[PDB]
Design a protein around this ligand. Sequence first.
Ligand SMILES: CN1[C@@H](C[C@@H](O)c2ccccc2)CCC[C@H]1CC(=O)c1ccccc1
Ligand SMILES: CN1[C@@H](C[C@@H](O)c2ccccc2)CCC[C@H]1CC(=O)c1ccccc1
Ligand SMILES: CN1[C@@H](C[C@@H](O)c2ccccc2)CCC[C@H]1CC(=O)c1ccccc1
Ligand SMILES: CN1[C@@H](C[C@@H](O)c2ccccc2)CCC[C@H]1CC(=O)c1ccccc1
Ligand SMILES: CN1[C@@H](C[C@@H](O)c2ccccc2)CCC[C@H]1CC(=O)c1ccccc1
Lengths: 206, 203, 205, 206, 205
Amino acid sequence: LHSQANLMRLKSDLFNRYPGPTKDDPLTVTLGFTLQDIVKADSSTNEVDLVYYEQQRWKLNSLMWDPNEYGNITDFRTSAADIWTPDITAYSSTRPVQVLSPQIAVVTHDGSVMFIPAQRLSFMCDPTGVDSEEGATCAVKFGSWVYSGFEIDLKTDTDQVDLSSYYASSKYEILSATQTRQVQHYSCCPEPYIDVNLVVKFRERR
Amino acid sequence: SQANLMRLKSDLFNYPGPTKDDPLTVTLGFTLQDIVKADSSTNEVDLVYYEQQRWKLNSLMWDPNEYGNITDFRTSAADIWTPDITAYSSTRPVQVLSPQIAVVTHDGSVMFIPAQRLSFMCDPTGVDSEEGATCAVKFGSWVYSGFEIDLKTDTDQVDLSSYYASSKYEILSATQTRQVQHYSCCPEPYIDVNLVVKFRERR
Amino acid sequence: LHSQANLMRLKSDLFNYPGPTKDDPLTVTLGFTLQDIVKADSSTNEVDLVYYEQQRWKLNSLMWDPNEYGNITDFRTSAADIWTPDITAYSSTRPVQVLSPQIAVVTHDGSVMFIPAQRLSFMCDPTGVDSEEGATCAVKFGSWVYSGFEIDLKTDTDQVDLSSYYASSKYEILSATQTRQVQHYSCCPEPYIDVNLVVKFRERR
Amino acid sequence: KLHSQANLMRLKSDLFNYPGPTKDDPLTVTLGFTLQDIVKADSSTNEVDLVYYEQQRWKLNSLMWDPNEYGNITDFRTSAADIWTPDITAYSSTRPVQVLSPQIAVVTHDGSVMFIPAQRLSFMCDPTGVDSEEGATCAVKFGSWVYSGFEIDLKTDTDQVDLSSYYASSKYEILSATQTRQVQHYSCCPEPYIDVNLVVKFRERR
Amino acid sequence: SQANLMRLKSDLFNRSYPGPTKDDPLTVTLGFTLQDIVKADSSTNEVDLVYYEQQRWKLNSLMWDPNEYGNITDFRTSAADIWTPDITAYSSTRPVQVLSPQIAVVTHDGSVMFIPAQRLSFMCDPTGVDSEEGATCAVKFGSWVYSGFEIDLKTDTDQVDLSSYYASSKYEILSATQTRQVQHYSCCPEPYIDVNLVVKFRERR
Ligand SMILES: CN1[C@@H](C[C@@H](O)c2ccccc2)CCC[C@H]1CC(=O)c1ccccc1
Ligand SMILES: CN1[C@@H](C[C@@H](O)c2ccccc2)CCC[C@H]1CC(=O)c1ccccc1
Ligand SMILES: CN1[C@@H](C[C@@H](O)c2ccccc2)CCC[C@H]1CC(=O)c1ccccc1
Ligand SMILES: CN1[C@@H](C[C@@H](O)c2ccccc2)CCC[C@H]1CC(=O)c1ccccc1
Ligand SMILES: CN1[C@@H](C[C@@H](O)c2ccccc2)CCC[C@H]1CC(=O)c1ccccc1
């Protein structure tokens, strides 16, 4: 019972009292993808639909505390709406992302945050060769829409997409799936933007 | 009578979810109402069902004698904490087919029974045979591990007593089973109730 | 401004109810006007209807004396500004699509009327629709969370209003009835009330 | 510049900080349709989809002001949500209307308001004969859902639907399109309701 | 540095913009980046595009001195925190779908840049797409409610940016131009400004 009034004393003290990153306050977001399924490939429009979850990690000094003086709370679940989250976007989506999981994140006492939204995405992809041995290869990069490498940097823990939850009876078998940090330039802006590029080769099952 | 109830609600409302120190057990039961569609071009199947959810909070307890012998009441689910029970292998956002209103009883227990339509990952191969198709989908808290939310069932049988009698697909069997599993994000295990459905096309 | 200010003052007073109970129960009267059977899907056994649903109920908490409020006898209000019953179609397969403005009318005796137009997909096997005998389907409506002890349902007629049915629909209506029923549900000991809409239809000749 | 926006921000504050029409204080709404396109005709469901915009004009004494007491301001743009708007609805839609334009109205100093939303509407319509020289004919009426002829009256400026912006390469050519005020009874209510009936004759382009 | 920023945004927002007037007009620069022609429907004559709409404008009310806010020169903010122009496609057939965060960048001289990604269905007869010559379609963009006297438009170039066009699209772009036009509409005596996007395209191979 005391435990609950310690948490709401913490949540109140952190929240009731962060404008996003700046070049003076740069931030690094670690990204990693777990591909659950390739649902559909449309060769009349060259759209492919993926189901996956995107693990996101970042850290802020604004959210730090000392467990010692909050009944030894080390972390808490909270709405993603109640905290700053990064605007990590797919570059070649052809439809708005459909969110498949609760929008709840976990804040740890070192100020570190973790969010793992599950999503359905339609993206630009030519499935030619998916009915052949070689299969088809498509790619899609993910990055902050409005924050350049000076404000938001990206990182991965591995270049292999997690395939351990891939749906074993999908219409499409995964032949490879990698995730790789890149740096590119864009017409709007002198400054470079960071992406993590998701490349997947796939073909029709047996 | 009415004054008692509007006093009770304002008293009870004016809980930050479960913690390791204060865990919660949620009881789950499924009632399968219809297998609407089986798509063999994308391997997706669409179900209409209820998700019975039961849990209990000390913070929602009261003495009926102090509130005109009121023992329970209806409230919007938005007025109370509800569990983030999610299908692991959905391919589209869940569509809610019923009012989201729960019932709280004086012992702090809550019952909530939403109707939903879910598209999930399922290969219907064999649905046009005697032996039918078989698919599974597991349900659980997205963000709470077994240390914060535990699950249980009262029965391993999915309720088929209202299943639509003229559906395109007849149900051969449907079971609900609690499992424990690990996920890459986290060292703590997460609990699920796995729904396994066997079905085929109607005569 | 004098009748305008009398209405501001009235809506203030009334709006500034925890739903029905066993002690303070409620009767909702329902009627359906079927405008169209839009689509029958025999690959999924789903049929789509367009109709409007007249709802009536009465709260003592919405009563006022017109003499105290400039002889105002009734007013239009947003459905969100008042309590509305949770009348739900039992066998829907998609969320209900609202086709009309969500505005109710409250009268000085506390009665309320609300008449939402809706597109509904519900579970229906349309087999026989291409024969002289036609197809037959049913969908029942009722409170999701209130039993017969908290909400009762009534109809004025068992005939669905077909006077606005689309004359050039793909589907011709052989009959349409609306019938009050009392039934038990697994969740609960106490029976719930429904109004059962039974439509009989065939492909246009 | 600064001053004229000081006066505008004043006016809006003063006007915004009306319960709809009553029998004692009824309102006349003028309606006019501009048909942009017949997008689709579905003879499997007898539904037709139109894109059009709906000109709405009405006048309120509560929105009246003196231009001379507010820096010679004679009108302003405002969010359609910041004011009362009429609940004009199609009687035979088969799907919720989709709004294709910003929801912004213009209020003039005499209390008059104009609002011209673009919409896509599916409504009940048997396209039988769209592939003949005579074409198909369909009708849909528009009116206040909850206000009778005692509360809201409807009028048109012309019985001709504006076809000057009809899409020249539509799948369907317009033979005629008219808008006509009618009076009718409905089961719910002893009071008659007003509608403007839009009658369109069309055929396949060839 | 955090403090200065949260001091600025606070200063700019909770202490003042009512949109443009005839007395205080605004010029918006528009540029399009065509990403993909996704679909061409010859049964309904609709074509779906994915594109950016680069928008620039400038407000005196959004100006500040960097020396009074720790030499801050710009900042990111949600599109909802500020006024944005109501730039609309004239001939869309469905509501626009937003594909990117709605976040803008404000600079100390009061200038704003906003680059939303969108998918649009618009009116387009794709006859000829299966030929060497291809199909031609056009769609104009402008303020829905502001005339040339309130909002003017300009382009930075006649060339639609094709440098990110999807290389394996079903349709290859033959040309794409963006041209400012002036037009009168039935509602209003004043002329309304548009930027007209004209795209020539054909099936790939
Ligand atoms: C750079 N950005 C790209 C998208 C890009 O962020 C991206 C890169 C990789 C993966 C996803 C998105 C497309 C056009 C929009 C711009 C960012 C942008 O919107 C902006 C706005 C105002 C000032 C400065 C920048
Ligand atoms: C564990 N979880 C699974 C979903 C899982 O909760 C589940 C299990 C069974 C049935 C449905 C969902 C997918 C990936 C996301 C993680 C949980 C998760 O989102 C999280 C976020 C921050 C900190 C700790 C955990
Ligand atoms: C009884 N009810 C039916 C729906 C039922 O209300 C109904 C009846 C006729 C027509 C439509 C709906 C489906 C399963 C859910 C339950 C109501 C229900 O959700 C509930 C929740 C907590 C305590 C007691 C009851
Ligand atoms: C009159 N109305 C018609 C629609 C009608 O307004 C209409 C007429 C022409 C074109 C469109 C709609 C359908 C059924 C609903 C009723 C009005 C209505 O909703 C109501 C509600 C409470 C009290 C009194 C009236
Ligand atoms: C002029 N306008 C056009 C749209 C037009 O702004 C446009 C032009 C080019 C490209 C897109 C939109 C269609 C009909 C609506 C009117 C503007 C309009 O809605 C209005 C409303 C009240 C008072 C004055 C004007």
